[PDB]
Amino acid sequence: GSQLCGRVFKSGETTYSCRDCAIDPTCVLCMDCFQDSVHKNHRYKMHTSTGGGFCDCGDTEAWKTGPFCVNHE
Ligand SMILES: [K+]
Ligand SMILES: [Zn+2]
Ligand SMILES: [Zn+2]
Ligand SMILES: [Zn+2]
């Protein structure tokens, strides 16, 4: 029983992309999902939302590995 996070970022919020696993340049995670995921042990990059955009945790098509954090698995 797996879940999509779906979090929509607030302006100024830090987001996290995994350069090892991202399928496309937009794939990103919210902090909560990132720190509960394999990708905090990978080559990751920080970004700032200007308001909106959304976490891709749970999207099996957005990630080469580790599409779910341990809360959404
Ligand atoms: K996204
Ligand atoms: Zn999330
Ligand atoms: Zn998650
Ligand atoms: Zn990764």
From Swiss-Prot:
Protein residues bound to Zn(2+) 3: 18, 21, 33, 39, 42, 57, 69, 72
Annotated positions binding Zn(2+) 2: 5, 18, 21, 30, 33, 39, 42, 55
Tissues/organs with expression: Broadly expressed, with highest levels in skeletal muscle, kidney and pancreas. Present in acinar cells of the pancreas (at protein level).
Subcellular location: Cytoplasm, Cytosol
Chain residues that bind Zn(2+) 1: 5, 30, 33, 55, 57, 69
Domain of life: Eukaryota
Zinc finger extent (UBR-type): 3-73
Result after altering residue 42 to R: In JBS; prevents proper folding of the UBR-type zinc finger; may decrease protein stability; loss of activity in a yeast-based assay
UniProt: a peptide binding residues: 54, 56, 59
Family: Belongs to the E3 ubiquitin-protein ligase UBR1-like family.
Record note on quaternary structure: Interacts with RECQL4.
Biological role: E3 ubiquitin-protein ligase which is a component of the N-end rule pathway. Recognizes and binds proteins bearing specific N-terminal residues that are destabilizing according to the N-end rule, leading to their ubiquitination and subsequent degradation. Recognizes both type-1 and type-2 N-degrons, containing positively charged amino acids (Arg, Lys and His) and bulky and hydrophobic amino acids, respectively. Does not ubiquitinate proteins that are acetylated at the N-terminus. In contrast, it strongly binds methylated N-degrons.
Disease link: Johanson-Blizzard syndrome: This disorder includes congenital exocrine pancreatic insufficiency, multiple malformations such as nasal wing aplasia, and intellectual disability. Pancreas of individuals with JBS do not express UBR1 and show intrauterine-onset destructive pancreatitis.
Notes concerning its domains: The RING-H2 zinc finger is an atypical RING finger with a His ligand in place of the fourth Cys of the classical motif. The UBR-type zinc finger forms a pocket that mediates recognition of type 1 N-degrons. It exhibits preference for arginine in the first position. It binds N-degrons with a methylated arginine in the first position.
Name by which UniProt lists this protein: E3 ubiquitin-protein ligase UBR1
Organism encoding this protein: Homo sapiens (Human)
